[PDB]
Structures are given as C-alpha cells and as structure tokens.
Design an enzyme around this catalytic site. Structure first.
Site, PDB file in Angstrom:
ATOM      1  N   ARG A   1       0.804  -1.225   0.000  1.00 20.39           N
ATOM      2  CA  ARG A   1       0.000   0.000   0.000  1.00 20.39           C
ATOM      3  C   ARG A   1       0.839   1.279   0.000  1.00 20.39           C
ATOM      4  O   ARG A   1       0.404   2.305  -0.503  1.00 20.39           O
ATOM      5  CB  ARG A   1      -0.938   0.027   1.209  1.00 20.39           C
ATOM      6  CG  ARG A   1      -2.100  -0.936   1.132  1.00 20.39           C
ATOM      7  CD  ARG A   1      -3.036  -0.725   2.312  1.00 20.39           C
ATOM      8  NE  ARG A   1      -3.662   0.587   2.274  1.00 20.39           N
ATOM      9  CZ  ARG A   1      -4.742   0.883   1.553  1.00 20.39           C
ATOM     10  NH1 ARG A   1      -5.330  -0.049   0.809  1.00 20.39           N
ATOM     11  NH2 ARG A   1      -5.241   2.113   1.578  1.00 20.39           N
TER      12      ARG A   1
ATOM     13  N   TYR B   1      -0.728  -1.386  -4.283  1.00 15.66           N
ATOM     14  CA  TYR B   1      -1.629  -2.536  -4.257  1.00 15.66           C
ATOM     15  C   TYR B   1      -2.861  -2.243  -3.396  1.00 15.66           C
ATOM     16  O   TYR B   1      -2.727  -1.762  -2.273  1.00 15.66           O
ATOM     17  CB  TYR B   1      -0.892  -3.779  -3.746  1.00 15.66           C
ATOM     18  CG  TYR B   1       0.255  -4.227  -4.634  1.00 15.66           C
ATOM     19  CD1 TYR B   1       1.534  -3.696  -4.477  1.00 15.66           C
ATOM     20  CD2 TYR B   1       0.062  -5.183  -5.627  1.00 15.66           C
ATOM     21  CE1 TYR B   1       2.591  -4.100  -5.283  1.00 15.66           C
ATOM     22  CE2 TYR B   1       1.119  -5.593  -6.449  1.00 15.66           C
ATOM     23  CZ  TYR B   1       2.377  -5.039  -6.273  1.00 15.66           C
ATOM     24  OH  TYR B   1       3.429  -5.420  -7.079  1.00 15.66           O
ATOM     25  N   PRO B   2      -4.073  -2.514  -3.924  1.00 16.35           N
ATOM     26  CA  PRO B   2      -5.298  -2.305  -3.141  1.00 16.35           C
ATOM     27  C   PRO B   2      -5.531  -3.377  -2.060  1.00 16.35           C
ATOM     28  O   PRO B   2      -6.454  -4.186  -2.168  1.00 16.35           O
ATOM     29  CB  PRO B   2      -6.393  -2.332  -4.212  1.00 16.35           C
ATOM     30  CG  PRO B   2      -5.851  -3.210  -5.261  1.00 16.35           C
ATOM     31  CD  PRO B   2      -4.371  -3.004  -5.283  1.00 16.35           C
ATOM     32  N   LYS B   3      -4.706  -3.347  -1.013  1.00 16.97           N
ATOM     33  CA  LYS B   3      -4.666  -4.418  -0.005  1.00 16.97           C
ATOM     34  C   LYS B   3      -5.450  -4.130   1.290  1.00 16.97           C
ATOM     35  O   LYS B   3      -5.401  -3.017   1.828  1.00 16.97           O
ATOM     36  CB  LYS B   3      -3.218  -4.782   0.320  1.00 16.97           C
ATOM     37  CG  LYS B   3      -2.476  -5.408  -0.846  1.00 16.97           C
ATOM     38  CD  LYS B   3      -1.024  -5.693  -0.507  1.00 16.97           C
ATOM     39  CE  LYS B   3      -0.387  -6.530  -1.594  1.00 16.97           C
ATOM     40  NZ  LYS B   3       1.010  -6.939  -1.253  1.00 16.97           N
ATOM     41  N   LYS B   4      -6.170  -5.155   1.765  1.00 16.69           N
ATOM     42  CA  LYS B   4      -6.900  -5.132   3.043  1.00 16.69           C
ATOM     43  C   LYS B   4      -6.538  -6.419   3.778  1.00 16.69           C
ATOM     44  O   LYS B   4      -5.946  -7.305   3.176  1.00 16.69           O
ATOM     45  CB  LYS B   4      -8.423  -5.045   2.808  1.00 16.69           C
ATOM     46  CG  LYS B   4      -8.883  -3.754   2.099  1.00 16.69           C
ATOM     47  CD  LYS B   4     -10.358  -3.748   1.747  1.00 16.69           C
ATOM     48  CE  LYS B   4     -11.229  -3.303   2.902  1.00 16.69           C
ATOM     49  NZ  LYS B   4     -12.605  -2.958   2.454  1.00 16.69           N
TER      50      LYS B   4
END
Lengths: 244, 244, 244, 244, 244, 244, 244, 244
Positions: G108, G113-116
């Site tokens: 992130r 990167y669209p990370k959760k």
C-alpha cells in the site's frame, strides 16, 4: 417388612433387588458369532470334565441386547466352546463380558452364566460389521465381518441358537469351602429368527490377565454368523453334581 | 481341567474367576459416615423382621478403597441401618453401590452384601471433604464435611467399625423359587484405626428408581465421621433362616 | 489360487474383492427426491445422444442406505435427468456421490452408475428433513423439506422408483483408447414402498470443480418426494453401443 | 396472493406457515408416565373451575415423538392432572414443554395445549429408562424407571392413552381483554399400542419460575407406565365457554 | 383456580402463561435494516390483497433485543415488505424468526407477528456489523455493514420506525376451518432514537424450505440503517376482515 | 453432448470423470517397503496361476504421494508378492489401500491395480519412520524403520522400482459372468531416484476381514528400503488372457 | 535518532518500520488464477478511467507466498481486471486481501496494491486444489481445481505473470483532500516459472460489504492456471496523474 | 468509474476503501496508561530530532475502542514518549499495535500513527485491571492495576488526553527514496471524560524483534491512569518538514 414378605423377594438390595423376576424377553438380540480352531491342549485345560471335546473349536460371540425386558440395553461378548455331554452336543460357556450389572447379576445368581464386567460394542463401520471388546480401558477383541455378504438358512441359524448351553454353577460357603459345584444345562425354546447372514470374517485377540480370551488363540477361522432373533431366557437344570 | 481340580475353584469363569480367594486386605480404607434421622414409616418398610428399630436412624456411607488386595482400587457408597437382633446392636446393610465388579461379586456371592454397580467418588474440595454417588449418569448423593475440624477418639472409631453387620442372603432356585433366604452376621474384628475426625456435615440426596437412597429422606443430621483404617473382610454367620 | 478358481471371482483384490456377489437387498432405502427446473442450454451439454430432453428438468437425489446387503450402511447423493430413449421415459444417471467404496466399485464395475466419493448426510433437524452433500471438505448441496407435510400416493411413488435408469458405461483400454462406450438400461422390478411424502421443498447448491452439481442451477422447484422402500437393484442391459 | 387464497391458508407466516394442515400421524410415540401424590392445596390453586379433583394426583409425562408427520422428530415433557368434567374423568393439561416450534404452534393454535419451549430427552441409561426436562439451561425434572421390569396390559395402556384431555383455550383481544376463553376436549380415537411396561419409578423435580413443575411436589409415587404406540392427534371440541 | 380468576389470565399454561401482560418496554433495541430490490413476480405471490406493492422492495431486518421487559434478551431476524393500505404506506410483516419463545407467543397471540423459532446473531466482527440467521442448524442469511460509516438523520430514523406495520392474524377453528383471518395495523408511537447509521451494506441469502427468505432474492441493495432505540410496541388494530 | 464427444471422454461421470487422462506424474513419491517371510501355504492360496512362487516372500508397502498430477496428494498401503511369469521375475499386486478416489478409479479402470479405500499415513516419529494403515476406523498395519540408518545404492533402488508389476484385470458382465479376466504387466520406465535408505525394520499387522493383510503373517523381516523418487505411471499390457 | 538518520528510514514505527527495505524475493510463489465472465455494467463502475475494458473479464487470484524475503510466509487473495492503457494490455488491480501486515503496508505504501486484511488458504483437499478467502469470520470465496489435470505452456505462464499491473495510489491530505491520486504501472521482469497447470475449475463467491468480490458475479469460467514460480516484485511507475 | 469520481474517493480499494471518511467518533474509549522510567540512552536512540527529552519517561498505553464510528470495535497497545517540540510539551508516538486493519490504514494514511498489527486485550481479572499485548502468537506486554483504587480529577485526565501528539509521516517514492518525511501534530479537541482512576500499577515486558517495547525497559513505575472518555480523532498538521 414382615418375614412372609421378605421370603417372596428374589434378591437384594431387599427393596431394590439386583435384578427383577423374569421372564426376560430379548427383543432383537443381534448375534455376531465366530467359530475358530485353536490349540487343543490349551482348550483341554479349559473345558471341565466330564465334558468331551471333538475338534479344537471355540465360538467367539458378541451380542447386542437392543431391548431386553427387565435388564435394559447392553452388549455382551465372550467365548463358548463346542462340546458334548453324554453324547449330547452343545456349547460350554467359558467366559462372558458385559456392561449391564443386573444382567451380570441375573446370569450368575439365577442361572450359571460365567459373567464378568466388560465393555463390548457392536456396530457397522461402513462396509464391515465390527464388534469390539474392552476390559477396563484395554482392548481384548476386535471382530470383523464383510457386511451381510451371504444369506444363511434361518432354520439352521434357529438350530444354532437352540443348542444346549452347559455352564458351571460354583458358589462357595461363607468360609470358602464348596457349597454348589455343578454342571448345568439350559436350552432355548422360544426363538424367532428375523435374519441370518455370513461373509468373510476375522478375529483379532489381545492378551489380558482378567479377560484371557487369547488363552485360546485363533489358529484358523472355521465359520461365522450374523443373526437377528427374539428369544426368552431359558431355565437351567442340573445335569452333573461334582459334590457326589 | 479334571473333576477334582474343578471342585477346588472358588467361582466362575472357571479359568478366570469373578474374584480370587481371600483374605481381602483393605489397606487405607477411608470412611465418610453420616448418621441421620429419617421417617420411621419409611424405615420400617425397609428393615426386615425379626430385626428391630429403636430411633429412626440411617448411616450413610462412602468408602474409598485405596488399596484392597485381591480386589483393587475402588469406591463404595450406600446406607446401613442401626438395628437390633435379640438385643444385640449392629448395622443392617440396606444397599450399597460400587465401581468394581470383583468386589461386587465377592460380596454378593461369598458373603451377602446388598451390592449393585454405581460410581462413587471421595475427594477434598479445598476446604471440604466431598463424597458423591452416581448411578449410571445420574447423581443420587452429595455428602459434605468441613475438613478434619474435630478429632475423634480412635477407639470409638474402632468400635463403630467393629459392630455386627446384619445382612440378607437371598439366592433363588433355577426356577425362581427360594433357594437361600437367611439373615447373617459378619462381625469385623481385624482393624487398625490410623486417624478419625468429624465436622459440620450435610447430605444431599436425589431420587433414583434403581438407587432409591432417598426413600429414606434426610430429616436431621445426627453425627458423622471421617476414618482412615486397615481392616480385613470378615466371614458371615447365618443367624436366622426364613425358610424355617 | 488355481486358474479355474481365479475365473470365478467377480473382482479384485482377488482374495478380498472390492465388492461381493449379489443380490444386493436394499432394506429401508430412504429417498429424498427434488425435481427442479434448470437452464436447457446447460442440460443440453450434459445429456448424451441419443437420449432426448423434453422439459429442462433435473432430479436431485439424496439416498440413505440404512441396511444394504453386501455393501453396508451408507448415504448417496446426486443428479438424475428425466429423459427418453426411443420414446421410453427414464432417468439419465448424471453424477452420484457416495460414502462407501464397495458401493462405488460395484456400481461402477458391475453396472454403470456414475459414482465418485462424497459425504452425504440425510437427517431430520427437528422441523425439517435435511439432506447435505460434501465433496472432500467442501459443502456442495443442502436440501430441505417440511417434514412429512403431505402424504403421496404410494403406487405413484413405486412408479417413480420403477422407471428405467439410463447410464453410460465408459471403460478405456490400457492405452487410453475407447474400449467400452455403452449406454445401458436398468429398471427396478422388486420393490416395496413403505411410505411416501411431500412438503415445501428447497435446494441450495454451491460451485465445486470436482462435484459440479451447480452446472445445472436451480431455477424453480417443480416437485419432491420422501420415500422409504425396500428394493433389489436390477441387472443392467446394453441398449446402445457407441462403438459398433 | 389473491384474497381467496389468503383465506384458505391455515396460519402465518402466509407463504411458510408455522405448521402444516393435518392429520398429524404420531408413529412410534414413546410414553413415560408417572402418576404421583402431591399436596392437595397446591393442586387446587392450579386446577381451573369447573374441573373437579378427587385425590391429589399428578401425571408427569415425557414423550419422545420419534416420527410425527408434519411436525418432525422431537420430545415433550410436562404435567397432566386427573380431573372430572361434569362426571366424566379426564386429564387436565397443566403445562407442556417441547423442543419443536411447529409442534408448539399447532398445539397452541389449532388445539389448546399449554405448550412452552423446553428440552426433554428420553433415553436408556443401561438398566434404567431416563426422562429429563430442562428449561433453558436448567434441569427441572429427572425421571427414572427400572427398564421394562413388568408387562402392562396393552388394552389398559390403550384406555389410558384414550382418556379425555381437557384444555384451556385462552386468546386475548389486541387490547389484552379476553377474546376466547374456553375449556375444550380432545380424545384419541386412532391408536395402536405396540407395547406397555411398568417397573420401579422415581421422579426428581427442581424449582424453576418459568417451568414450575415442583409447585406440585412429589410426595408419593403411585403408578407408572412405559408405552409405545401409534396415534393420530385428536380434533378438539369446546365443552365450556367462560365468556357466554 | 376459581372461574372468575381463570378469565383474568392472558394466556396458557394457566399458572405460568406463555407470556406475561404488557407493556413490553424495548430498551436499547438495535435495528439492522437492509432494503433491497427483488423479483416483482415473487413479491406479488407473497403480498396478500388488499395491500398494494409499488416498487419491488423487501426490508430485511435483524433486531437485537438487549433488554426487553417481560420477554428477556433475544434476537430476531426477518423480512418486512414496503406496501400501502388505502394509500397509506407501511410495512407488511412477511416472516420473522426468533430466539425466545415468550417473544414468539406474545407476538403471534396478542398481536399478529408472523413469528417462527430461529437463531439470529447480531455482532461486530472487528470491521463490520454482522447479522446472521439460522433456521435449525442451517444458515439462511448473512448481513454485513461497514461499521457506522455514515450518520443518519435521527428524525428520519424515527419516521422509519414509526410507520404502520401490516400483519395477518390467521387462526383456525379446531376443525381446520378459518376462524380469524384479519389484516391488522400496529404503529409505534412511543420511541426514542439514540443513534442512526449507514455504511456499505450487503446481504447474502440461502435457500431453506422452512425459512424461505430467498424466495425473495437480492437483486440490488437500495438502502440500509443501523439504529439503536427505545420503543414500546403498540396495540394492534383490525383494518380489514377477510371473513366479514 | 454429441455422440462423437461422448466417445472421446475417458470415463464417467460424463462431464466430471472419475479421473482425468494422463500421463500421471508422481513427484516425490515416497516409498517404505518391507520384504518379509510368511507361511508358504497361506501365500500359495493367494497367488493366482500362472504366476509362480519360489520363496515365501511378501513386500509390504506404504507410499506417500506428495504431488501426483491429475490425482493429488494422498497415501497408499498394501502388499505386493515377488513372483515370476514364465521365467520373468516381478511383483504380483495383491491388495492396495488409498484415501483418494480418483486414484482408486484410474488404478482400477485404466490399469488393473487391486485398489480399495483405506487410510495410510507416512511420518517421522522423531527417530523412527512410521507407516500406518487403517481400514475404516481400525488399525491393520504399523511399520517402523530406524530413520535413514544406512544408505542404499540409488541404482539398486531404481531397479527395484522398475521391477515388472503383475496385475489381475477382472470385470464382470452385467449378469455377473466373466467379461474381462486378464493378467497384465506394467513396468516403470521414467524414473529419477533422489535417495534410498535402509535400517532396522519391523512390521506389526492386525486381522481385518476387509483388509486381510495378516493372512500373510510376518514370520521374519528380510529386507527394507526407504526411497524418494519421481516416476510416471506405467502403461499396462495384457500378458495372459484367462478367457481365450 | 539524529535528523539525518530519520530521513534514511523507509517507514514507521521509526525504530521498527512497518516493513523493511527490498528487494522482496518471492521464492516458490504459488498462483491459483481463475479468469471469468461477469456483468459488463458492474465491471464498468469498478474500472477507473482512462483504463479500457474489452471483454467483461475478472481474474480471481489466490497466491500462496511460501517464502517471501523481508515479509514472511503468507497467503493473498483478490481480483485483477484485464484492461488496457493506451492500447497496452495489463491487469488492473481491483482488490486484494492478505494475511500479513508488513505485506499489506509495503504494498500500500511503497507501491499501490489495493490491499486489506483477510484470511486466505490455499491447500489440496485430496482430489482438488482448494483456495478460500475469509473476511473477518465470514467466508467470501471458495475456488476449486481438479489437481494438476493438464500441463500449461510454462513460457505462456511467464507471459501471464510478466504483464503490466495497473494500480491506483490514492493518499489523502491530513484534511481529507486529495494529495496523491495516481495511476501506476508495475511489470515483473525477474521470473522463473517452475510449473504450470490447468484443470476443471470453479469459483464460488459470497456477498460481503467489506470484501465485495461478488459485486463482480461469476457468469462463466473462461480459463484458469496453477503456477509455481520465483519472482522479484517490480518498481512501480506513475503513468497517469489525476491531479495534474 | 468516471475520472471525476475516482478523484473524490479517499482511498483504495477504489470501490471498497481501506477506510471510510470521518469524523471518527470514539465512544467510550477506555485508556490504561502507565508512565515509567527507562534507560536514558535507549530512549535517546528512539526519539527523532528535533524532539527533545527531559526525563527518561515512557507512556505505555492500552486502549479499548468499544465503539468507534467507521472503524468498529477493537483494541490498541503501544508506547508514547513525553517530549517537547520547540518548547511545547507533547507525546511522541513511538509504536502502536492494533487488531483492526481499517484503523491501521486510516491511522497510517490519513494521519501518521506508527501502527502495526497486534493483539491487545483489556479486561478486569476480578480485582485487577489487565492489559495484554501479543505480537502474532507471542506475549510482549502484561499491564496490571489495582481496580479503580483511587479517583483522578476528570479535568486533569482531560488535560492528559488533550496533550499534543507528535507523529512521523514517512512515505517512500516508488524507488524507495524519501517522498514524504514530516513531523506532524494532532491534538484532541472534542472530549468528554466520563471517569478517571489510578491505583498500584505494574508493567511486565518481553523482548520481541518486531514489537520491541522492551528496548525501553521498565526501571521504575512513575504514574498511571484508567480513563473512559468520548473523543473525536483529531486532524493532523505538519510542524516540521525534513526534506525542505
């Protein structure tokens, strides 16, 4: 209670007797029998005279008592030994193990069944009929059969159940001397066979000093049956008194 | 085995008897006794004539058998009733429940102990001596005592242990008719008291059809004792034959 | 094993075959059937020529085999597809998932059931008849019915059970070549229906690559039945040979 | 839904009713009844006029519904009270507890059973028939019977099953004012008694504000029966309107 | 119980009614509402005349009743359907599933809530407000919201809570005949909203025959709210009698 | 599915075949072999003509398939028997047990492996390599080796892996008559042996009717090997047709 | 820490940064890719300008990071969307869910990167390659593949891995203002593919408000791959600045 | 998504952002602070210039976020360091650990909190307030306080909550070069202190490379507070740019 009432009691605890009066109806008694060839002189040591041995055979049994009036829901396992008395053949009852105390008590004290406490189990493990037997926490017997592989004649099965059962009534006096020492006979007359089956069969036994089934080790599987039947427990009668 | 060797055996299974020959040496038998008053009418129904009741008393018992020769390590719980036979004070044994089959069978078949299968436990719950009894999966008695609050006279403890034990021996014939029906005395004489205590004591009973201890409900706690002792099991004497 | 005796065995392992010889008596076979509407396009792909689709229907099934002679106790779940061959209406057997390996082998090798290993469960969750299917660890199907809400015509249930079953036997050569590519018919004749029921019915499916029941999605629940019955599964008959 | 269709639904939720239409066929309903003496004062408070009491009797029940069409598989426990209505002896239904909501709903709304939510279990504990009832997480009833110790006449058991059941139907208006207040009668007409038994029997109760069975405490056990039967749920009839 | 006193009771069991008298004060009632778009055709069937559907909307609800006077602590989940009666907009109460039997009885019998037994759970899984519903052992609904992501107008939340609720009271006669088939209105007046929130919201449904929420599939999530509020549930009022 | 497409599928279920096409690449297949002496009589009964026995030898195997393309990750255990076919030494495949159904199906239907369902495990118990086999819930084999105590020649290990495997292919006709009855040969061609080891080795067996490994009892341990390798499943070839 | 040394740190906590400095060597990265067809309308909303959608495709991914230098051992699952930027085909990175916080932070904050946080699991369930994703306690995705059923071209797998990845870096100012709103490109160059496989593949998704993968529903499975590979993740490059 | 819409999203994933927009309202935030003396050398290494240290003090914190709008319910633990920035005393935020990813993301990306993943718990152990922190599976902090032993002034507690918090915002460029490197200030403005307490207080720490709290070891406990309050997350402001 008054003297004339205590006399009408079958057993003690006086007001809560170890077992009730019969008759004892075994509805859906499920037999799993295995006859096997064992060691002749080990068998010879175990069978009491004047009983006679032909072949060196043992009938391992595990019996699921699904619905027994008076006694409850329990399982039984042990060894009966094909013998003959005065020519008349039948099974000598060697040792039996079960998880119901009133059933133990009624067998030892009303008849002469050689009962001890044990934890047997009959069930289906997918494709296999498995019967196991524990003494305390230790496994002593694991029996297996291919599930209902071949049909058995319901009449020959009926004759199997109806064979005479020979047992020993041994009761000591209060000082330990012999009081009753007796060979007995009981033969089932009330029977109904719902189904009878056989299939490939094995018997695995382990050594246990208090459940010494493997004192008669399996040398070869001879025959086996899986039977559903209704029976009424038979009355025993003395055939041989060792106390002359 | 041969005829003369079978008559030498104490019980069956023939080659693995339900119990061995004694003496049965009880090392570190731990008693938890509770004398309580009950309904007279309920007590009277339960005690067999010709035994006589003075005060409507019941002695609840739980016994940890840490080390019993021949028999094993097990626990025992039940009710004995203070009575009199021709003036001589002793305990009539009403019912008892234990988790060891050899001990059940020896007591029922060598002597005349009113024994059934049950699951008692004795332990200390931090500050409280706790005795429980189950029949099957159900709780039927919970006894509590403040832990060793007051010392008891060891000789008085010895006298409690050594009183006559009155019992009914009831064995049916094969046909269900009366075979034996006798009152017996087993007086206990070989005893060593290691310690003896008392304290605040209470008894909680629950109803069970096969373990009906609450048929003699607790009305009042009179006295109690916690006793560690070595004893030897005494032999029985016939004192009254009901079969004339 | 002598050459002649080898030839007499139905299967392998030679001395312990994957399955025994029949007949296989299905005692108390319990059916939970759900016929439903799906995509015709999806159906088209799935149904092989020369079998004909009328309406886009799928019969989801979960069977509990409580007591099957020679095979054991087990549960099976899958999809049948209502079709016709030469104008004769039957079910095409699309995919079946089972709990018992002998039951898989016999179905795949003595007949032509499209069987794989799976974990079905038929049970009553208080209210509701629940049937579930897992492939490996993953849930693929959950079937529900309001428990025995409406009685069905038992004769109409027998007719549903007694219709032809169309199955594909497909066995490769050792080299991967087609060896047997036959369409087969098996039609039950020996049947006793003990009860038949409907009720409000639903079917939930989930996507799984190795048990792709949801390749035929539920668009609308058409009909349903809960049948307990005794059957003996029938001899198959080749009706179309793809290789000729 | 068209008005006309709305009107022909038996209950609500409209498209998934709390219960289906009958008849409700109880296959292998298993009874464990215990008639006992209670305090007459406590019992009078409980019994509604115009029903009359002779002796201070309570019938404790636990019933296993193994297979009930429309409702499912569940267990029920509670108290019925022997009464008479204008010279006709029957059982007043005092309070019942079950673990099946369709069964509570139909029981309360089609007929007039005094049903609440509860968790009963009927099972054989080796040598003892055991019925238990919990309200939420708390034990309220423990019932025991020596397992099938004595045979009861099937007809006499049938007569007991067929005794009129008297029920209060009490529905409020929306403001909480009396809307319906009736004594009804339901009487079992279709019955097959499969077997009936008695034996030594005890009932242990515990106090619970929301399941207050112990407000009618056990003073003496009078009789008991263990019965399996097939019945159809009876249609109810108003016998006394409290608001006319 | 005297005839006059019988008439004063709201319900049954007579001495321990299914539910107590009100008012029922809902303290800290927590709402999780999800309005969504479904099939109009499916909606049509479900909504009874004379209630009118505008847009094809369903309000899914899960309520946590943290502290409800007279009923207890419990959770409820279900479907309301936005409708109009004579041009007056309200929610039609379609199906509700609950955790508390008194709460089911009072709702079904004092008012006309379409209530069945079910197992809802409202909780925060770290990130997310999670609401789930099980019928029996089976999952039927999983609701999610980004935790308190956006504040709602509290007055607008009160308005959503204070709209009319249209419900069907349907009670059969003992013979299965229609007895009460009424449409009813209940409108909350006594309300305090403590907070109101939205956030990104989703709803996952599964097929179940006895809790068929998925008969109204989620096609699009329209709106959502998470409200904590005190309410007192209102007196119902008959607005249309299907039987007149 | 078009007839032409039907014909090019390897197996059934048609759209989800029991197994995919090969080649099946066994990456890091891990072997634990135990060659031992058995009773010659027992072994003769088991080995089919025309295969010939010299010494009474059995190869017990347990194989961990860590990574098998098409089939997956699983374990296999069983017995192979050193024999010769017309002067060519190989291993007769007696019986094999695995926990992977695609692997059983391909093994039985593409080739001719004697495969049943079973539960083997290969693992290091600190200082010992352990292989176990269960049939259903029952233990049948426990194999131990001192962990990699001695290095085996990689080529000699490769030669052992590449020994011809002799298999019986036995498929019935639909009426249960012999359809296919062949002795086949498969021989591993693509191999990389990564490592090979020996050490002290024991094999404990237990009797089981459906997994009867102990019909070939362990009399003496002769040799053992622990091998990891990469192989491709060999193509089978008929060497003896029993029906020609 | 001296001012000059503060400036040299890549992240925060200052003395224990969220992530270390690279390179990050992904050793034995295991890919499970499923490309599928979804709604174009749903896709439209999701894909940001100026990236272009051709066909309505979504690449579902689950990655097992068995040995990642600087980050650890962890699993990630998400959605990539095949797009083009200025005619150059790449994947748009839509949403990713991970098991390792350093791996989230670095993705992130060092890239885009669209990370959760989420809980993925890649494993082989005997038969089947299984990939699952949970958000919090809730299941959102279940992916299945027939284990290594067909080999893929390794060079073609490298090409699929080596395509551009388009991601949005979006960082607010402290006041909620846009500060960085960039589109970025990262393209892997350092790659070694060890194996590549296909097989029959399915994808099951569930609705979740905080992991809304099912906002792009599976309409049809287009392609699939199972790749094990070593990579070093690339330096990002801004390709379009929304703020300029 | 239209370019214009892209620009008004706060974060990524684009359609499901790592965190929502504020304000973030912390309802009933529960503080457990422990101010203690550490080694001055260790503390100097840790504190960034231009922040200045007087005494070697550390504030250990554990904070239970019972109800945080947008973020959820979670717990945080870590260390703050009393410092001054150009004559203005505040707490330098050293390192923080939480079990909520939206909270880590917003904390790191909207503001500049030094947040990592961790597992804190705040709970009353009967007579003691306990705060624990784990990093992964390992315990790093155990904090205890005698439960609310002494009352703290609410205003003085409020003053402590409102002390400036100094934070480092450190974001790299894509090549790993410094992009943003700022000291910021956030200061709580909206507060309601509900209660504040102190008491005997201890802090036990353990070494962990990735959560190295014990690099600032506990030499002496100086003060402590237990506070519940409502606050709004403060807006941050740059006070020192390291790159200008």
């Amino acid at each position: 209670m008054v003297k004339d009432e205590v006399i009408k009691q079958i057993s003690t605890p006086l007001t809560s007797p170890a077992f009730p009066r019969g008759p004892y109806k075994f509805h859906n008694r499920e037999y799993f029998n295995i006859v096997y060839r064992t060691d002749m002189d080990a068998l010879r040591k175990v069978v009491p005279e004047p009983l006679e041995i032909d072949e060196p055979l043992v009938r391992f049994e595990i019996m699921a008592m699904h619905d027994t009036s008076g006694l409850g829901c329990y399982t039984e396992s042990g060894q009966a030994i094909p013998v003959s008395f005065n020519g008349v053949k039948g099974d000598y009852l060697h040792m039996m193990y079960l998880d119901n105390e009133p059933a133990i008590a009624v067998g030892r004290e009303l008849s002469a069944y050689p009962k001890k406490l044990g934890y047997p189990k009959l069930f289906v493990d997918s494709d296999t009929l498995v019967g196991t037997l524990d003494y305390g926490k230790l496994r002593v017997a694991t029996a297996t059969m291919g599930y209902k592989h071949k049909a058995l004649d319901a009449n020959e099965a009926k004759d199997q159940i109806c064979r005479p059962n020979y047992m020993l009534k041994i009761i000591p006096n209060y000082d330990g001397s012999p009081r009753i020492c007796e060979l007995i006979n009981a033969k089932i007359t009330d029977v109904t066979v719902h189904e009878a089956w056989t299939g490939p069969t094995r018997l695995q036994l382990f050594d246990h000093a208090m459940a010494p089934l493997n004192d008669l080790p399996v040398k070869e599987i001879v025959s086996s049956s899986h039977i559903l039947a209704d029976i009424i427990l038979p009355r025993a009668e003395v055939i041989y008194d060792y106390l002359k």
